[model samples]
Target chain A: MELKNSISDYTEAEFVQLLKEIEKENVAATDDVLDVLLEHFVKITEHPDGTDLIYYPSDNRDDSPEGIVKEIKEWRAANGKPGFKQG
Target chain B: MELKNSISDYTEAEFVQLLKEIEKENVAATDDVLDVLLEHFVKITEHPDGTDLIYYPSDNRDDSPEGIVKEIKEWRAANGKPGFKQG
Candidate 1:
């Protein structure tokens, strides 16, 4: 499904793949899509230190789509939040 | 001053002009800048119905920087929020 669909329908891998595509092309998605993406991104990728990468990225690149995807991957693998694919 | 400066330092005209420039170039500012912009935008442009244009735009275009600037200008003129330059 496309990013316009609800986030609940996506797996963690699919979400990451779509984010990579968005970063690669610098495509401007709709605000609805971006809102969903950002909401879920913040939900899963928040640092244990209580920093939100979306508002306070650790590095200059951390707010980019690729950077967000990277942080989400690491955070999920570290068991920071439940994966989208988890039943 | 650049957008990196605190929002408190900017006049409403300056803030609207910067948002127009950002829209024209599609330049991605730092999240710190975007965060400040969004915070103030929401503060001034909230509908009397309590709808937030940032998350629930009236139209797809309403989420764009240009659209946001338009809303702010109208809202300010309608006496919705005190102008940044008022104080």
Candidate 2:
């Protein structure tokens, strides 16, 4: 996916794709990456079904790709949104 | 204001207080500070009149205290919310 200068510029779909890509790298969450995750959280919260998404923690010291994906999956299930496409 | 471990833990009022304090310091927008501002943006967006807050840019390269305060003031005026208290 093409990168945007700021995380704020990405569409929700693109943001999800970016997260998946980042997750695959199994990289540590740097402050910059945390900003990206926070942007994603903001986007999710703004969705019609996203009010409760904030209640989920995204700032775990263990902010592994797996943990972030798991949080998103749980949130999606709880809100009746379709899950992320499996590879 | 007392600091919270996570910006998400701050109440809207506390967040506002924190911003005012930060602004007074004339600090740079560190990723950590940006995260805090993003949390503030999220809180405002969750407010009934806060949907448009995201449209306002908070990530200016010159995210000086004055610029941030100006942006917030403009947003408040646009949305019929009260402006931040002046010292």
Candidate 3:
């Protein structure tokens, strides 16, 4: 599934509001915590090979973060897209 | 503080091993899930302005993912770093 919103849509101000809302429900949400979570959503759903990146079909969806990047790079190489950028 | 290991260090193969290890502890860890977690560590601890990006000192660390990025960009503009890469 595609990310319903862009990272820009999840503005810092909006995330702060989300934190406040979560707090009202007694959910443990910190800036660090939520940032991680949001990025997870963005990376998995939004990032170009999101699903294939982290998923291992034979293994029943067993996967890891590194696996995702590896798959992404491989996929990119196979496709016409440029591979992962090393920052 | 710095990221103890580089994302390069956390190779996809190694992460898969980590997944197997975590499974021994009965903890839930998925590839997509762990990739998010590891990147959070990389982003916050390793990313040049990790701490500052994710932290809100006056607010007691009540922060969000967007805040970390916002601060990273702001800090970069001030510090001569290239700042966030919008991919």
Q: What value of lDDT does candidate 2 attain over all alpha carbons?
A: 0.45
Ranking by TM-score: 1, 2, 3
Instruction: Tell me the lDDT of model 1 at A51.
Output: 30
Q: Measured against the native two-chain assembly using Cα atoms, what DockQ does each of the candidate structures obtain, in the order listed?
A: 0.04, 0.04, 0.09
With candidate 1 superimposed using the best TM-score fit, by how many Å does residue B67's alpha carbon deviate from the native?
Answer: 8.2
lDDT (CA) per prediction: 0.47, 0.45, 0.39
Residue-by-residue lDDT tens digits, candidate 2, A1-87: 122334344444544555554353235432333333445444643444332333344455234444544665666679776555333
What TM-scores do the predictions have?
0.35, 0.28, 0.25
- Tens digits of per-residue lDDT, candidate 3, A2-37, equal 132333434333333433432332343323333345
Model 3 - which docking category? incorrect
Query: Model 2 in CAPRI terms: which quality?
Result: incorrect
Estimate, for each residue in B1-87, the C-alpha lDDT of model 1 and write its tens digit: 122223344465655665553343225433322443444444334545222543456774657655765675576668745445533
TM-score of chain B of each: 0.40, 0.36, 0.35
lDDT of 2 by residue, B1-87 (tens): 122344334344544554554343235433333444545454543444342333333465244434444565665579776554344
User: Residues A1-87, candidate 1, lDDT per residue (tens digit)?
Assistant: 012223344565555565553343335532222332343344434545333554567765566655665666676668745445542
